[PDB]
Structure formats: structure tokens, C-alpha cells
Design a protein around this ligand. Structure first.
Ligand SMILES: [Cu+2]
Lengths: 359, 128, 113
């Protein structure tokens, strides 16, 4: 027989063409998975099973795929096993399982719940038991090395691109808590910023529009706040409005999940917006995508939202991907006005997160 | 007499929404019992007495104080009295002189454990 | 009665999941064989019939796979994780013997205040 079925193959397309769509498959959440696609032509390249409500990220060096999920000996009964798994990016094969205490966050795929330090040495994840804390996983040693309980009352992880192993979290007091890790993964020091926003009067979405040394956040009411960490202490400021009087008269407000993005080279910030906003519409699909110049604080463009809910930006290639839950839209954002290149239909059944393979 | 036993469960609830102290009492004693089974690290409870207005502020600083400080800023002048954070199946106690009740103002007891003061809060008062 | 089996029913103003009332249970009882969560996220819903605001506690029923019926995603008064117990983008079954999410209940606590 000339033809013989073989396995052990690598992803057919180069790494720079790949994107990862985290499909929660909410209708059957125990079978969530990551779908790998070629954004240049929309070809399905492969997938990684992630059991119950998996979360995913690609290693900074782009060699491995990190997943986080929960298992039970008998799925709906039996002992619980929360873990981080390491998979080879090219072969999409399981390589290593890292044990986690049974409290990793089980929830929708916001970027800030499963991240890694800038130097790629540690995986930083959110815990909820429901009491909150941040977990630290040493990649090299493949071990959970720290439980940042000082983050109790805070939520999500925001890595500081200008430091090797530091990250911030948003806390219930409306401020930011910064954590600096030692070379071993344990907390070396921490600092608290002054209040940035009013939790009760102007809550912000947790999704940051992250620059090299500062982060921008949008609020339920269309305001923009900032956290500058270029120095020792974090300096907070804001708000300034994304809306003019006409926008307000029509009740335009932000809406989505991973709803904002920052094109660092130009300072342009992208946000999903919808009209007729009111209490309870902060997760509404985008009616439009607004492009803001963070320097001049002016809106420079507004285009059809295609019902998008989440987005992600590729700095080098000047690309923006939007996701409406099942379809992925690819945009060229080299110019102020985004340009739609193509739409990948049926990329997932229920995804709120898509990511580019690091390049 | 001058004794009151309050409870807290795994559902973030107190079995009382208001405590009344008898004027005759010179010093009052409050007893907290965690009737749940979740560890203090996951679902702990405590009782913090403070002027109705200081509640939120106290709870906020208490959150920054951490668990090692029973989620209450050390030496906090806004706190009349507070118990230690207990876990499921645990109990604590606190006794404070009643000779410090701002006449005309309201006092409230709540749990400073991160995010719990939301529901776990009540009204403590003097007299009848 | 199928009014309660609608995502628009006033008590479900902060539900992110499946209505247990369409899964063999009711707004206050878990379907047979699923376990109530001791914890939950809370919402303040306006009752359009009497014009008053009530506090609703959204406990999940756990230990069984997704019911898949009457899926809702309403966000009235819902807030981010930094106001955790007002957040519905997390599995409120997270601390149960078995954290598999089945459906969401809408328990009326009392008048909002
Ligand atoms: Cu408590």
C-alpha cells in the first residue's frame, strides 16, 4: 500500500501567519478549545483541547502554547485538578502539566486573567475562591511558586512592558496595585497608586489600551483614564471624554469585552461603541469602532463595528483583529481609518478572545 | 444582658441586621460564629463597628491592611471595635466600653473581608 | 408562567447563563440532581409591575453540564471583577464540590436599599 496515514506533523503555515481563537463553547463548556487559523487566507490550521472553560496564551518566544483549565476525575464529580499545560506551538502536542491550587479563575476569556511577565519567565494568573489572589507559575521549573494574596480585592493582570517581571492589577478602591517579583517568582515589593477612578460613579472596563510605559482605560460612560508607570511610582490621571456633545445627546457609550486596543506607534486607541447606551448595555456588540488620538484627545475615525465584541492588535504589522463571537475580521490600521481586509467566518461558536502569534 | 451572638455563613450573610445594646451596659460583648465550612482564606467573616459614614472608608483601608491585620487598618481611629477574621467553624469575641457613642449619629457593624461589607452590614444602636 | 422563562422577565436582569426554570427547576429551586452554589453574584432589578427595585441573588446550580436552555446575558447593574459580587462573567459554581455550571437561579432577597 503506497498510501499510509501518518501523524507527527507540524502546522502547515509559518508562525507569523497564525492567530488563536479561544472558543469557550459555552453551550458545552466542558469541551472548550483553541482554534488555530491563518489570518492571511482564513485556513483552519489545527486546535488544542482545553476541557472546561480553558484560557490560553502564546509564550513570548513563540515556541509554546500555554493553556489553563480544570479537570475532574469524572467531569461532573470526583477530584478537581486545576492546571496550566504547556503545548508545542508547531506540533500542537501536549508536553507538560503544571499543578495549580484548586482556585484558578473560571470565567470569560478576558486577556488579563491569564498572562506572563515581560521576560517570559513567569505565568501570572487570576485566582478566585471567591476571595481573589494572583498565582505565579515558574515556567522553567514548571511549578506554582507564589500566591500573591496582597492582591485580594483586586482583579486582572496588566503586565508592564517596560519591566522584566512587574505587573499591575485593578483594585476595589479605584486604584492600581503594582507587584514586583524577584528572580524566584515571589513578591519582592509592591506599591499602591492614588485613586484613579470612582468605582461607584464611573467604573472602568478592565481591558487596557496598553503602551510601553502607560495604560489607558475606558469607562462605562465613555471617559478615559490613565496609569503612567514610566517612573518608580504609578501616576494616575483622568478622566477626559471620548464623547462630544452630539455623541452624548445620542447616548453613545463603550461596549464589549476585550473592547479596546492601542497602536503604540501612532498613539491611536481603538474602542467599540454603540448608541442609546444606558444601564446594562456595557457588553453590547459594537455599532461602530472609534479611533482616538490619545495625544490630541480627538476622535480621528469611526467605522462600522460589524457587531464586534473583542479585539487585538499586532504592533509590527499594523493589524487589528475584531471578533463578534464566531467570526474574525482582519483590519489594516497603518492609516487613521481602519481598512477591512477579510472576514473569517465560523472561526468559533462562542469566542470572546483572539490573539496573534508573537513575531 | 450585655451579650450578643451573631452568625455568618458560606452565603455571605449575618443572622442579624441590627444589634441593640442596653444603656445599663458599661461594656458590651459581641460574639461571632462562622456557621459555614469554607476556610477563612476563601470565605472569612469578621465584625467591624464604626460610624455609619465611616463604614466604606474603613472597609477600604481594611482591605489594604490585609488578612494579617484582620482586614482592618491598624490603629484606625474610625473603628470603635472589631473582631478577628474567622473561618468556617471558627468563632471570635470582642468587648468594648459603650461610653463612646456619638450622640445623634448612627453606628453600623459590617464585615471588612474583601467585598463582603456589601451585604454583611447592619445597624448597632444604644438604648431602646 | 412562561413569562419567567423569558430573558426579559424582570428578575433575570443580571443573568449570564441558562434559566433554571427552563431546565427542570424553578427560579428558586435547582433542577433534580444539580447542587446549589452557596455564593453568587447579586443584582438590583426594577420590577416594572409595581415600579420598585429589588435585590436578586443569582445562585448557580452545579454538578451537571450546561443545560443549554433559555440562555440569557443581561447586565443591569453588573460590574467588573474589582466589584466581584456584582460581577457575572465568572462561574458562581467556582467553590462547589463540582464546579461544572448547569443553570442560574434568580432568588428574590428583598427591596433594594
Ligand atoms: Cu464576611
Amino acid at each position: 500500500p503506497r498510501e499510509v496515514l501518518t501523524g507527527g506533523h507540524s502546522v502547515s503555515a509559518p508562525q507569523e501567519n497564525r492567530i488563536y481563537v479561544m472558543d469557550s463553547v459555552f453551550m458545552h463548556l466542558t469541551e472548550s478549545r483553541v482554534h488555530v487559523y491563518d489570518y492571511t487566507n482564513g485556513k483552519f490550521l489545527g486546535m488544542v483541547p482545553t476541557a472546561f472553560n480553558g484560557h490560553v496564551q502564546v509564550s513570548n518566544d513563540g515556541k509554546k502554547i500555554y493553556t489553563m483549565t480544570t479537570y475532574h476525575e469524572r467531569i461532573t464529580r470526583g477530584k478537581r485538578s486545576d492546571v496550566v499545560e504547556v503545548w508545542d506551538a508547531d506540533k500542537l502536542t501536549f508536553e507538560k502539566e503544571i499543578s495549580l491550587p484548586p482556585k484558578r479563575v473560571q470565567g470569560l476569556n478576558y486577556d488579563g486573567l491569564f498572562r506572563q511577565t515581560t521576560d517570559g519567565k513567569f505565568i501570572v494568573l487570576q485566582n478566585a475562591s471567591p476571595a481573589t489572589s494572583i498565582g505565579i507559575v515558574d515556567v522553567a521549573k514548571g511549578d506554582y511558586v507564589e500566591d500573591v494574596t496582597a492582591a485580594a480585592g483586586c482583579w486582572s493582570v496588566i503586565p508592564q512592558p517596560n519591566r522584566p517581571r512587574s505587573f499591575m492589577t485593578i483594585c476595589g478602591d479605584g486604584g492600581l496595585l503594582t507587584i514586583n517579583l524577584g528572580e524566584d517568582g515571589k513578591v519582592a515589593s509592591q506599591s499602591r497608586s492614588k485613586q484613579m477612578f470612582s468605582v461607584k460613579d464611573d467604573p472602568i472596563f478592565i481591558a487596557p489600551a496598553l503602551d510601553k510605559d502607560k495604560a489607558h482605560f475606558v469607562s462605562y460612560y465613555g471617559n478615559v483614564y490613565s496609569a503612567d508607570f514610566s517612573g518608580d511610582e504609578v501616576k494616575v490621571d483622568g478622566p477626559w471624554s471620548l464623547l462630544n456633545d452630539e455623541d452624548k445627546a445620542k447616548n453613545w457609550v463603550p461596549g464589549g469585552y476585550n473592547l479596546v486596543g492601542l497602536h503604540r506607534a501612532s498613539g491611536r486607541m481603538y474602542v467599540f461603541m454603540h448608541p442609546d447606551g444606558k444601564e446594562g448595555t456595557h457588553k453590547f456588540p459594537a455599532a461602530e469602532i472609534w479611533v482616538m488620538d490619545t495625544k490630541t484627545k480627538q476622535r480621528v475615525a469611526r467605522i462600522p463595528g460589524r457587531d464586534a465584541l473583542s479585539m487585538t492588535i499586532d504592533q509590527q504589522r499594523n493589524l487589528m483583529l475584531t471578533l463578534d463571537g464566531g467570526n474574525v475580521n482582519v483590519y489594516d490600521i497603518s492609516q487613521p481609518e481602519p481598512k477591512l481586509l477579510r472576514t473569517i467566518e465560523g472561526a468559533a461558536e462562542a469566542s470572546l478572545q483572539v490573539q496573534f502569534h508573537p513575531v | 444582658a450585655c451579650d450578643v451572638s451573631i452568625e455568618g455563613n458560606d452565603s455571605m450573610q449575618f443572622n442579624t441586621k441590627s444589634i441593640v445594646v442596653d444603656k445599663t451596659c458599661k461594656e458590651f460583648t459581641i460574639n461571632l460564629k462562622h456557621t459555614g465550612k469554607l476556610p477563612k482564606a476563601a470565605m472569612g467573616h469578621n465584625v467591624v463597628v464604626s460610624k455609619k459614614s465611616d463604614e466604606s472608608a474603613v472597609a477600604t483601608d481594611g482591605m489594604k491592611a490585609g488578612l494579617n491585620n484582620d482586614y482592618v487598618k491598624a490603629g484606625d481611629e474610625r473603628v470603635i471595635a472589631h473582631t478577628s477574621v474567622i473561618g468556617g467553624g471558627e468563632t471570635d469575641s470582642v468587648t468594648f466600653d459603650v461610653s463612646k457613642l456619638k450622640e445623634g449619629e448612627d453606628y453600623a457593624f459590617f464585615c471588612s473581608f474583601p467585598g463582603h461589607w456589601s451585604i454583611m452590614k447592619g445597624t448597632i444602636e444604644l438604648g431602646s | 408562567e412562561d413569562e419567567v422563562n423569558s430573558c426579559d422577565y424582570w428578575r433575570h436582569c443580571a443573568v449570564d447563563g441558562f434559566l433554571c426554570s427552563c431546565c427542570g427547576g424553578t427560579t428558586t429551586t435547582c433542577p433534580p440532581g444539580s447542587t446549589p452554589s452557596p455564593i453568587s453574584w447579586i443584582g438590583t432589578c426594577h420590577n416594572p409591575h409595581d415600579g420598585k427595585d429589588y435585590l436578586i441573588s443569582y445562585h448557580d446550580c452545579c454538578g451537571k453540564t450546561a443545560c443549554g436552555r433559555c440562555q440569557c446575558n443581561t447586565q443591569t447593574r453588573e460590574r467588573p471583577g474589582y466589584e466581584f459580587f456584582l460581577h457575572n462573567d465568572v462561574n458562581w459554581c467556582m467553590a462547589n464540590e463540582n464546579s461544572t455550571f448547569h443553570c442560574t437561579t434568580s432568588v428574590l432577597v428583598g427591596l433594594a436599599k
